[PDB]
C-alpha cells in the first residue's frame, strides 16, 4: 500500500533524526523489535497509543507521524460543475443570505483553498461606507480573486478607512493577509456577481505559523522587519544580518575596509549602499548579497487590476493560446494568474509545463479538453464549463478546443528557499530527500 | 485549565472556518453530539483519532492539520544538565564492536536542532581514509554542523564516491551537506577518546514542505532541484525557471525588456551573463524581484572543514565581555552561524546578546557559567555547568557571566528567509495579531 509504505519511511526518518536504531525505539517505546520493523516496512500502521508514547519521551510532535495521502495519483484532479452545484451552501450575514459558496477543485496535497462565492447582497450605490456591506476583519492568508459580473470589492486600508473597487468581468485583485474585505453585487446587474477566489498561506501557515506561534508576542513580532519602502527595507536587512554576525562595528569596519564614517551613514540611512558595496558587506557578514537585497520595490497592500490593463500575447510561437496577465505582486513572485483564450484542435502535443501548483477553472461557455503526461502515461479528459482542476507542478500539459480558462499558479512551500536548498543538496539525492528508505547506517 | 486542549480546540475551530462549516454543521456532518463539538473547541476534552478519521474522510482536511505543537520551553530558555545527557546515553555497535556513544543534549519540540553528543569508541592505527575499521553511514537528511574535541578523524566521501579523511583536533569544525556519507573515529595513541558535538538540524526541507514534495512523482519532484553547480550555471537555471513561470514567449520577453533576440539568446545559452542593471530589467518583465533571479555569490563545497587556526576572532561588545571565534559556516545556509565564545565578564548587568535565530549552547569549558535573560516580561537566571546544554528561543535578550567557554550554534529555522520577508510585508502589528489568535480561548 502506498500509504503504509510512505508511513513507514516517515517513521524511519523520525528515528534517524533522533539517532535511534529500531532496537533502541523498541525498548524506549516498550514494544517488540519486530513491531517496530513491521511499521518501518509498512506491514502495519503505527497506532496512536504508540505515537503518544513517542511524543511523551522524545522531542517529537504528533503532527510528524501523520503523512498526507495522494488524492491526485494521475497528476491532475478534476471536479465537475455538477459536483460543485451539489456542494452549494448559503452564508447569512445580518440575518439575510449574503454569499452562495461552492466547492471547486482542490487536493489534500496542494496548499490552496479555492472559493466560488456568488454575491447575493445588492447595493444601490458605490459607497464604501454602505451599511449593506457585511465586512470580515481579514484572514491570515493570501487571497487572489477573479471577478465575474458587476462585483463591488470593498477593503480597508491600514488606517481603517474603507475603500471600494468597482469591478467587472475580467478584473482581478490580490490582498495582503489580514486585509478586511467583502463583496456585493451592484444593483441593476443582469445577474448576481461572482468571484473565483484562491486562498493560500504560502510561507505563513502550517508548521511555519506553529514555529512562530510558540514564540512570545514580543519575540515573534521582531521577525517582521521595516519593509515600508525600499530604503527602509535595505536598512532593516543590513541591521538583521549585522546582528546575526555578532560583529562589532569596528570589526565590521576592518573587515570591509569601510571607514567608521561610511559605516555610520549606512546604519543611519544617510547613504544607501551601492550594489558593489553590498557585495563587500555580504561577504563580511558571511551571507549572500541576495540575502541583503530588498525587493526592488514595495507593493501596495491591495493590488487591483482591471482587464484593460492585462497585457496579452500568443503562446507559443505557433499560436495555440492567448495569455492574459491578471493581477500580480512582486511580494509573491511565485503567484501567477492568467486568462487563457484557447483556440487549438485536439492534439497530443504537450506545450505547457510550469514548476508550480495550478488551479484551473473553465470560465467560458464551451467545453475544452486537457491532455497531460504523468508517470510515463498520457491522459485525455474533458473540462466542461464550470469544471475545475488541480494540476501538479511540472506536469506537461495542454488545453485544446475553443474557449476560455482561468489559470492560477502558486508556489506552495517548495518554490523559493526550499527549492534553493534542494538545489544545493543535488538532484541526485532528491528521492532520499523526499522520503527516506534507508536507515542512516 | 489545560493550555494544550485550549489551543487544540482553537485549532479545530480554525479548521471548520477554512472549510466553511459552523460548529452546528460539524456536529451534523460528523454525526456527533454538538456538546462534544463544543467541548473540543472550548478545550474541555481532546479530540479523538476516530473523529479525525471521519473528518478526513468527508472533508478536504488532513490528519496532520488537527495536531499542533506544544511549547516545551515556556521560560524562553531550556537547559539540559550533563546528568540528563548521561541518562540518555546509548552505546551503538558497528561490525560487532562498540563504535559510538550517543548522548542527547538540549533540544525542544519548538527548535529544529537534533544535537548529539557522540564519543568515538573506535580507534584506528592509521589515517588512511579507506581504513576498513571506519564504519560509514549512507548520509542523512539533516544538515550537520560538527565541533571536534580531541583527536578525531573525520571521514567523508566526495561527490564521486571517493573516500577522504580530515585530521581534526580540538576547536576544529566542519559542515557537511545532507546525504553526504561520513563517519568518525579516534586516532590510536590519543590520551582519551575523540569527541564530537554533532549539531544536526533541518532547515527548509522538513515538515510540511517534505509532505508537499512527497506527494509528487520523482520526475516531477526532481525538477525543483536546479543546476547550482557553479555561479554561472545557477544564474541560467534561475533565469530559465522564472521565465517558465511567466509563460512568456521569447519574442514577448524581448519586446518587454527591449532586448534583442540575439542578446536574449546569449543569456539562455550561457554565452553572456546578465549584468545587475540587465537583471533588474529582466526581473521587472518577469514580475519577480532581481533578488529572485540572483544565485548565491558562489557555490560552496559540499564539505566545509575549518581548523581552529583559521577562525577569525574579535572582542564583543565594545565593553569586552566576550571573545567570539568564527567557526565553520557555508553561504548555502546564510542563517547558520557557529561560534566559540570565551566569556570573561563578572559585573555587568546588561543583557548584551540578542539574535533572531534559534540557538544551541554547550558549555565546552571546565567552569560553570551564569545565563541571564528576559522572556514574557520575566527575568531569569540559571547556571550552565560544564557539560550542560541550552536552547534559546529567537530574539531572547541574554548574556553569559563568569569565566569560561561555550559552543554556540545559531540556525534560522522555518521562519528566517522567505517566511520572514512575507511577515515583514504583513507588518509587525498583524504578526502580533496572528500569534494572538492562536492563544484565544473560545
Ligand atoms: Fe552524522
UniProtKB/Swiss-Prot annotation, chain A:
Key words, A-Z: Dioxygenase, DNA-binding, Iron, Metal-binding, Oxidoreductase, Repeat
Residues given in the record as Fe cation binding sites: 139, 181
UniProt-listed SUPFAM superfamilies: lambda repressor-like DNA-binding domains (SSF47413), RmlC-like cupins (SSF51182)
Pathway annotation from the record: Phosphorus metabolism; phosphonate biosynthesis
Gene Ontology molecular-function annotations: DNA binding; DNA-binding transcription factor activity; ferrous iron binding; oxidoreductase activity, acting on single donors with incorporation of molecular oxygen, incorporation of two atoms of oxygen
PANTHER family tied to this protein: HTH-TYPE TRANSCRIPTIONAL REGULATOR, METHYLPHOSPHONATE SYNTHASE
Name under which the protein is recorded: Methylphosphonate synthase
Originating gene: mpnS
Curated annotation (Swiss-Prot), chain B:
EC number of the protein: 1.13.11.73
First-level EC class: oxidoreductase
Keyword DNA-binding: yes
Keywords assigned by UniProt, alphabetized: Dioxygenase, DNA-binding, Iron, Metal-binding, Oxidoreductase, Repeat
GO biological process: organic phosphonate biosynthetic process; regulation of DNA-templated transcription
Requisite cofactors: Fe(2+)
UniProt DNA-binding region: 24-42, 250-269
One Pfam family this sequence matches: HTH_3
Tree of life domain: Archaea
Catalytic activity: 2-hydroxyethylphosphonate + O2 = methylphosphonate + hydrogencarbonate + H(+)
UniProt pathway: Phosphorus metabolism; phosphonate biosynthesis
Domain HTH cro/C1-type: 15-66, 239-293
Coiled-coil segments: none
Record: residues binding Fe cation: 140, 182
A single GO molecular function term of this UniProt record: oxidoreductase activity, acting on single donors with incorporation of molecular oxygen, incorporation of two atoms of oxygen
UniProt family annotation: Belongs to the non-heme iron-dependent dioxygenase family.
Protein purpose: Catalyzes the conversion of 2-hydroxyethylphosphonate into methylphosphonate in the methylphosphonate biosynthesis pathway.
Additional detail: The existence of the methylphosphonate biosynthesis pathway in marine microbes may explain the supersaturation of the aerobic ocean with methane. Methane is probably released following degradation of methylphosphonate produced by MpnS.
Protein name: Methylphosphonate synthase
Gene: mpnS
Amino acid at each position: 500500500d502506498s500509504y503504509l509504505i510512505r508511513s513507514g519511511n516517515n517513521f524511519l526518518g523520525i528515528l534517524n533524526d533522533i539517532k535511534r536504531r529500531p532496537e533502541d525505539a523498541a525498548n524506549e517505546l516498550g514494544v517488540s523489535i519486530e513491531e517496530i520493523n513491521s511499521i518501518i516496512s509498512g506491514k502495519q500502521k503505527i497506532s496512536p497509543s504508540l505515537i503518544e508514547k513517542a511524543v511523551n519521551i522524545w522531542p517529537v510532535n504528533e503532527r510528524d507521524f501523520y503523512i498526507v495521502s495522494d488524492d491526485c495519483s494521475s497528476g491532475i484532479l478534476i471536479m465537475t460543475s455538477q459536483d460543485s452545484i451539489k456542494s452549494s451552501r448559503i452564508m447569512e450575514r445580518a440575518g439575510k443570505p449574503y454569499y452562495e459558496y461552492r466547492d471547486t477543485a482542490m487536493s489534500k496535497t496542494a496548499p490552496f483553498r479555492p472559493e466560488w462565492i456568488l454575491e447575493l447582497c445588492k447595493v444601490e450605490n458605490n459607497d464604501p461606507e454602505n451599511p449593506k456591506a457585511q465586512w470580515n476583519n481579514g484572514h491570515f492568508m493570501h487571497q487572489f480573486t477573479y471577478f465575474i459580473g458587476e462585483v463591488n470589492f470593498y477593503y480597508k486600508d491600514p488606517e481603517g478607512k474603507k475603500h471600494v473597487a468597482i469591478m467587472n468581468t475580467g478584473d482581478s485583485m490580490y490582498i495582503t493577509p489580514f486585509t478586511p474585505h467583502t463583496f456585493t453585487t451592484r444593483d441593476g446587474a443582469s445577474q448576481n456577481g461572482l468571484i473565483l477566489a484562491l486562498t493560500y498561506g504560502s510561507k505563513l501557515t502550517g508548521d511555519i505559523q506553529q514555529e512562530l506561534s510558540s514564540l512570545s508576542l514580543d519575540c515573534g513580532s521582531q521577525y517582521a522587519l521595516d519593509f515600508t519602502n525600499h530604503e527602509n527595507a535595505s536598512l532593516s536587512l543590513l541591521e538583521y544580518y549585522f546582528e546575526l554576525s555578532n560583529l562589532t562595528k569596528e570589526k565590521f569596519a576592518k573587515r570591509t575596509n569601510f571607514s567608521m564614517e561610511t559605516l555610520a551613514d549606512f546604519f543611519t540611512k544617510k547613504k544607501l549602499p551601492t550594489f558593489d558595496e553590498l557585495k563587500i558587506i555580504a561577504k563580511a557578514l558571511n551571507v549572500n548579497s541576495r540575502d541583503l537585497m530588498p525587493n526592488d520595490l514595495t507593493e501596495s497592500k491591495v493590488i487591483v487590476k482591471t482587464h484593460d490593463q492585462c497585457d496579452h500575447w500568443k503562446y507559443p510561437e505557433s499560436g495555440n493560446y492567448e495569455f492574459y496577465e491578471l493581477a500580480s505582486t512582486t511580494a509573491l513572485p511565485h503567484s501567477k494568474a492568467f486568462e487563457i483564450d484557447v483556440s487549438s484542435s485536439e492534439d497530443l502535443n504537450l506545450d505547457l509545463k510550469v514548476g508550480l501548483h495550478q488551479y484551473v477553472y473553465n470560465i467560458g461557455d464551451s467545453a475544452l479538453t486537457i491532455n497531460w503526461n504523468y508517470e510515463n502515461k498520457t491522459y485525455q479528459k474533458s473540462l466542461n464549463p464550470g469544471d475545475s482542476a488541480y494540476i501538479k507542478p511540472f506536469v506537461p500539459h495542454n488545453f485544446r478546443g475553443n474557449g476560455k480558462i482561468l489559470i492560477l499558479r502558486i508556489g506552495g512551500k517548495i518554490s523559493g528557499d526550499s527549492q534553493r536548498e534542494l538545489s544545493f543538496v543535488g538532484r541526485e539525492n532528491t528521492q532520499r530527500a523526499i522520503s527516506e528508505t534507508m536507515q542512516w547506517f
